[PDB]
Amino acid sequence: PPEGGFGWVVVFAATWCNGSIFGIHNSVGILYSMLLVEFQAAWVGALAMGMIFFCSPIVSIFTDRLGCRITATAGAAVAFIGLHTSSFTSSLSLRYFTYGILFGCGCSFAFQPSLVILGHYFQRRLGLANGVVSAGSSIFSMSFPFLIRMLGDKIKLAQTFQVLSTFMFVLMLLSLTRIWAFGIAAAALGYFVPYVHLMKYVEEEFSEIKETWVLLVCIGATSGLGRLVSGHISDSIPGLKKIYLQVLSFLLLGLMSMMIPLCRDFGGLIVVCLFLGLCNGFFITIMAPIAFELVGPMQASQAIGYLLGMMALPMIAGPPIAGLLRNCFGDYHVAFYFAGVPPIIGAVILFFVPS
């Protein structure tokens, strides 16, 4: 366990992989809305988003029996074909298959393997390393739209589709390198509502923030620092009591989601956003270290796969829930007063029975 050092190569590989994957996933927004029953577009987008997590449990066996490297390069090749293919005509079913199925399965193959073998070489500063990887992913992703838009040179749809395969090619070159889950999914149920709330509140009355180097950075600045410091704190805390980290994160996240009185004012809004980004880091990133401490390196792959599979459905359900409840219970304020109730539920049994 060289605990980093020469393993900073591994960390850089993880940063590039996990950043680019979700960068192109977010770019799907540009894809299906500008480069694309018209609702088939939304259905295909939802299918693509789900396929990422859905097949991760199956990807787990591939990873275990082939080494992270083989699965990573295979998924890289699949995606490389994917976002370049559909070079045929705009046929409905042809495009559907080519983009959706291939992109989803390849991304599901390529995402998970970046989170298995790291522990075998990282033992003492693994939490800090995970925080660093999360920060790198955040910074790379938030600029990913800027980079693609800038060096895309305003080229047509097909050529842009083909170009976006360059990141996957570079990834392929770089690729040579239950109660717990129930509660964590319960937390995920409420995780995403405050994200939409903050984004819309920032955009509404503070439209002067428009630049890609600023707007997405408005949340990224908190995201990276919070993720890194949370990883360091987790590496500091010994044992499974780290669970208390996400316990506190759930409490604070619910409180902030409830903090309507002060979210409406910019002065308190800045601090609330910083806290929410801290909590995002505490929640999203701590999962892998917690699973490692819970089950050991041998089972980490299956554990993370199972957790991601469970989280899949709530993740896709989030934005639909927000949209439906925006006007369901009179007003969204009352409809989402309870936004912290789900994490409150998740913050109950996490001491009586850890496993």
Compute and round to an integer the Cα radius of gyration of the chain: 20
Which of 345, 323, 351, 348 has its CA nearest to residue 335? 323
How far is 270 from 256, CA to CA, in rounded Å? 12
Q: Please report which residue ranges of 85-156 form alpha helices under DSSP H.
A: 92-95, 102-111, 118-121, 126-151
The Cα–Cα gap between 45 and 59 comes to: 21
**Residue ranges of domains in the chain:** 1-177, 178-355
Breaks after residues in the chain, judged by C–N over 2.5 Å:
36, 177
Is the CATH number 1.20.1250.20 carried by domain 178-355? Answer: yes
Evaluate whether the domain defined by 1-177 bears CATH number 3.40.50.1110.
no
C-alpha to C-alpha distance for 183 and 180, rounded to whole angstroms:
5
Matching fold, domains 1-177 and 178-355: yes
Separation of first and last alpha carbons in the chain? 27
